[PDB]
Amino acid sequence: GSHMATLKVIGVGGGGNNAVNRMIDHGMNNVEFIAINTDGQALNLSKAESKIQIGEKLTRGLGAGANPEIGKKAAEESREQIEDAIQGADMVFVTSGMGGGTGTGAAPVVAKIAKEMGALTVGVVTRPFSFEGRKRQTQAAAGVEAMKAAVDTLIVIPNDRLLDIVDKSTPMMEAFKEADNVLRQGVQGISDLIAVSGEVNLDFADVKTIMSNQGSALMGIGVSSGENRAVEAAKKAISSPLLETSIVGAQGVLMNITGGESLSLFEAQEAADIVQDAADEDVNMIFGTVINPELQDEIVVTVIATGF
Ligand SMILES: Nc1nc2c(ncn2[C@@H]2O[C@H](COP(=O)(O)OP(=O)(O)O)[C@@H](O)[C@H]2O)c(=O)[nH]1
Numbered sequence: 288g289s290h291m292a293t294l295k296v297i298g299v300g301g302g303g304n305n306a307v308n309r310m311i312d313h314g315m316n317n318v319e320f321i322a323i324n325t326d327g328q329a330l331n332l333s334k335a336e337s338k339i340q341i342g343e344k345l346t347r348g349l350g351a352g353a354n355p356e357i358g359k360k361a362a363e364e365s366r367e368q369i370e371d372a373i374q375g376a377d378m379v380f381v382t383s384g385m386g387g388g389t390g391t392g393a394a395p396v397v398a399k400i401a402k403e404m405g406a407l408t409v410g411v412v413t414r415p416f417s418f419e420g421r422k423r424q425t426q427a428a429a430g431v432e433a434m435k436a437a438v439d440t441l442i443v444i445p446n447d448r449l450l451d452i453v454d455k456s457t458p459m460m461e462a463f464k465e466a467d468n469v470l471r472q473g474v475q476g477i478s479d480l481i482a483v484s485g486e487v488n489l490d491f492a493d494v495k496t497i498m499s500n501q502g503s504a505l506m507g508i509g510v511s512s513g514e515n516r517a518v519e520a521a522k523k524a525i526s527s528p529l530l531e532t533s534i535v536g537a538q539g540v541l542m543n544i545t546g547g548e549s550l551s552l553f554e555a556q557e558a559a560d561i562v563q564d565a566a567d568e569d570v571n572m573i574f575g576t577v578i579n580p581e582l583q584d585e586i587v588v589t590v591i592a593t594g595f
């Protein structure tokens with residue numbers, strides 16, 4: 288009697304659906320993708336197997352014209368279709384760009400529906416670039432607050448952080464792929480945790496304990512080899528330049544270390560200590576270990592931090 292958790296990733300609005308499209312291209316297994324949009328033109332280009340056009344009577348098939356009230360009403364008008372799409376989910380990631388009309392207004396409705404169905408509900412959203420102006424930022428902030436009230440856990444990516452990782456020539460689409468990686472690697476990290484029985488095993492119940500009704504979250508993965516690999520991988524897992532919520536102040540952590548047969552007890556301690564020292568709190572750790580004999584010198588550290 289084993290459990291196989293059903294994970295769904297739901298893009299809401301333009302940015303959320305483009306993140307979904309790029310995740311589908313990258314390849315993702317045992318995850319169902321759902322695309323939700325008012326904009327029928329964009330929805331027709333989605334690569335997701337489940338598409339939900341919301342608000343057609345309201346927008347005549349256009350987007351929401353930057354009006355979050357239209358996104359919200361569109362989603363409410365389509366509650367039954369959204370429910371049907373979520374059915375069966377054990378975990379739902381709702382991804383959306385805040386500041387426009389559809390994501391800002393509809394993404395919190397989608398998240399609330401998922402949570403009401405008992406699914407562990409994680410939001411992964413962007414805040415707009417400052418160059419998009421104060422009004423867009425203020426609308427986005429109201430969306431972020433509505434998301435907080437509707438999810439178990441929330442990861443916010445301020446788009447301005449992308450300006451910290453580009454040079455003057457980095458293509459915009461390349462920068463967007465870096466933001467996509469936050470979602471994709473968090474999903475993959477949970478998927479991998481569920482699929483393998485670890486030598487010290489963590490499972491979906493541990494994910495639920497760390498993430499259910501917690502507020503802000505960090506989800507990261509680090510990979511390193513050679514000398515100091517465990518410390519370096521742990522540092523990478525907790526240190527993304529793109530996150531509003533850093534590791535500092537976390538009081539709950541799920542941490543998994545995967546390595547080959549050379550994985551040492553000492554380096555597992557070193558990695559665990561990096562995470563708790565950076566948190567600078569009494570951290571309640573759920574610690575796991577997977578020995579993958581295919582691996583030679585690589586170590587992979589996965590962190591989920593909550594409790595801020
Ligand atoms: N990082 C990232 N941000 C995006 C992307 N598309 C849109 N955005 C951001 O998301 C916000 C809302 O845009 P959009 O999702 O198209 O609006 P909506 O469809 O009305 O929800 C914009 O103001 C941008 O800050 C994307 O592909 N990547």
Ligand SMILES: [Ca+2]
Nearest residue numbers: 480483484489
């Ligand atoms: Ca497992």
